[PDB]
Design a protein around this ligand. Structure first.
Ligand SMILES: *Cc1c(C)c(=O)n2c(=O)c(C)c(C)n12
Ligand SMILES: [Cl-]
Ligand SMILES: [Cl-]
Ligand SMILES: [Mg+2]
Ligand SMILES: [Mg+2]
Ligand SMILES: [Mg+2]
Ligand SMILES: [Mn+2]
Ligand SMILES: [Mn+2]
Ligand SMILES: [Mn+2]
Length: 309
């Protein structure tokens, strides 16, 4: 007498091989194919971070581990996971169509991004519900945010504590914690979008639980459009704080991201590292959640809380 439920896990997506770069970035750029020089630059960046194929495996592993863990920790519901991506197949609509074809009538969705925004999360949930409505006979209840789930806060708190415990004593007393997420166009403010407030609260909760008194909030990985995006960018923030107070170590927590992808392995571990190397400071960036059991249990709790169980 276990009830059957779909578990729709949504994410941005990643190329599966080098020859996917063109079509992935064309989709991100709203139909504008990157010029040859940019295509070559992107290939070089992926080669520099160790290759493309490991990156797509992570979302698959997160969805699989989440399904199995959810089915182990309670006895009322049997979940089946379906992956729906924004920028490459399987797309969100493909996942909903597959759920419908398989006989799913009830689903719960979650986006692998802990902060709500009108640009990403709300768009993903709207797409999923609209496909379900067009097909009929299937309903979806959607997680909207989960940055404040205690288990997730604790993941990052314990990683930050481990990092501060490892540094030399002079660094430990003169370090700066930078907490960041993916930048979005500033115009989201016109809708009252809580995304910036939620990033600031994540930073408060992590710094507080870790006992870190000196921290700052920044943004990273902005796209390219004429209208402004949320700032300051982590590169400028790092340099400005160093000019202000001479910090000897910077610790980066990209809380908006859940996996080892280009926006962390390159935009932090390279682009921020260039700045810290130039100023003479040490660089630290603790492990991303990926598919680790502590993170999977946090996500399972988010899902069961959403269902009132
Ligand atoms: C992959 C991706 C894009 C294109 C984007 O705008 N964002 C976000 O805001 C997040 C959190 C992720 C992932 N992505
Ligand atoms: Cl929610
Ligand atoms: Cl929310
Ligand atoms: Mg090849
Ligand atoms: Mg909430
Ligand atoms: Mg960039
Ligand atoms: Mn397993
Ligand atoms: Mn601020
Ligand atoms: Mn981006």
């Amino acid at each position: 007498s276990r009830k059957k439920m779909g578990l729709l896990v949504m994410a941005c997506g990643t190329p599966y091989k080098e020859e996917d770069i063109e079509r992935y970035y064309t989709h991100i750029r709203r139909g504008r194919k990157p010029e040859p020089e940019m295509l070559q630059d992107l290939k070089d960046r992926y080669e520099a971070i160790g290759g493309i194929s490991p990156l797509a495996q992570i979302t698959e592993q997160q969805a699989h581990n989440l399904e199995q863990h959810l089915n182990e920790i309670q006895d009322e519901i049997t979940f089946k996971a379906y992956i729906g991506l924004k920028h490459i197949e399987p797309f969100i609509e493909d996942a909903v169509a597959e759920m419908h074809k398989d006989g799913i009538t009830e689903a719960v969705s979650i986006v692998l991004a802990p902060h709500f925004s009108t640009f990403s999360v709300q768009s993903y949930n709207k797409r999923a519900k609209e496909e379900a409505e067009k097909l009929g006979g299937l309903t979806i209840t959607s997680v909207e945010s989960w940055y404040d789930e205690p288990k997730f806060v604790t993941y990052w708190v314990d990683r930050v504590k481990e990092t501060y415990a490892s540094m030399p004593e002079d660094e430990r007393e003169n370090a700066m914690l930078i907490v960041s997420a993916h930048s979005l166009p500033e115009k989201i403010k016109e809708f009252g979008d809580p995304y910036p407030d939620q990033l600031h609260e994540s930073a408060k909760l992590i710094a507080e639980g870790a006992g870190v008194s000196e921290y700052a909030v920044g943004w990273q990985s902005e796209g390219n459009t004429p209208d402004p995006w949320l700032g300051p960018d982590v590169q400028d923030l790092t340099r400005d704080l160093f000019e202000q107070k001479g910090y000897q170590a910077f610790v980066y927590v990209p809380v908006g991201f859940v996996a080892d992808h280009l926006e962390v392995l390159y935009d932090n571990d390279y682009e921020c590292k260039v700045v810290t190397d130039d100023i003479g400071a040490s660089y630290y960036r603790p492990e991303m959640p990926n598919a680790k059991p502590e993170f999977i249990d946090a996500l399972a709790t988010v899902v069961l809380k959403k269902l009132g169980r």
